[PDB]
Design a protein around this ligand. Sequence first.
Ligand SMILES: Cc1cc(C)nc(SCC(=O)Nc2cccc(COc3ccc(NC(=O)c4cnn(C)c4)cc3)c2)n1
Ligand SMILES: [Zn+2]
Length: 288
Amino acid sequence: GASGSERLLDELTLEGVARYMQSERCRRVICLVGAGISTSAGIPDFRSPSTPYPEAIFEISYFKKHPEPFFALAKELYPGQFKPTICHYFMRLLKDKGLLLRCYTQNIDTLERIAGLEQEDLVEAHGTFYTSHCVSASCRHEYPLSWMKEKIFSEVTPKCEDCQSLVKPDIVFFGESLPARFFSCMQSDFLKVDLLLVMGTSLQVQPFASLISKAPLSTPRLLINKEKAGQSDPFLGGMDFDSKKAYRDVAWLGECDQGCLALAELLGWKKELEDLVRREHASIDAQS
Ligand SMILES: Cc1cc(C)nc(SCC(=O)Nc2cccc(COc3ccc(NC(=O)c4cnn(C)c4)cc3)c2)n1
Ligand SMILES: [Zn+2]
């Protein structure tokens, strides 16, 4: 139930969440993540202001007629390295510890995959650059990022080797529907969730934001983010961190890496997390 029933967290703190996680009551964790988990990897959030008309470049109709701007922007914004963050590897540890039901991400940077989350573990709600497809319905040839990268840097508009149609990265352009996978997984996963870990997202983009309202009433929800988010708008379920009726929502305010480190430390996972990150970062740095 809600605040009227007995609550699962013994206290509304990171410490309470950790105790819950290590109890038999918590078996399945869903992560909801956004751009805030990749900024420390040097991938800016293109929605953060500090980073025909401007919006055309992300519209599917404009792209199909004039793809060159998008692909020029893609070359300019292409990360110099793909090194997932502590937050990404914390989710890998959740997987290793048998706690990860699913990671729903709004990011297109592939860092979840690089950090060791597999397709089954992931719902890329806004799509991804990881794969691309020929846009012709009768073809739909798939291309890997290695192929798309070469086209982007060579400044050659990517065309299908089979039919010469445009090849589009599998991101959800505006005007496109979210992937069917998002809706199908959401319908199943939120019947099964014991904990919702919301990291590095302001929960301002829909329908991704509405996911928090899909959790059972009793399911604790931990937000690790620079700012509080997910509360109902006094003008326009929602997060309740602070009222007298608060019973399950916890906000840890700071950088995602530091929050995940703090949680891992409480869990006795800090050495495991350090060892994993340092090994994988070393491996990525040594790519030859
Ligand atoms: C080029 C490249 C390759 C790889 C692997 N990673 C990167 S990361 C840096 C970056 O930002 N690179 C970058 C390069 C070119 C273009 C963009 C813009 O990306 C997106 C991604 C998703 C959306 N769609 C929604 O938000 C949405 C739709 N419907 N709804 C409801 C919501 C829109 C734009 C990013 N960049
Ligand atoms: Zn084709």
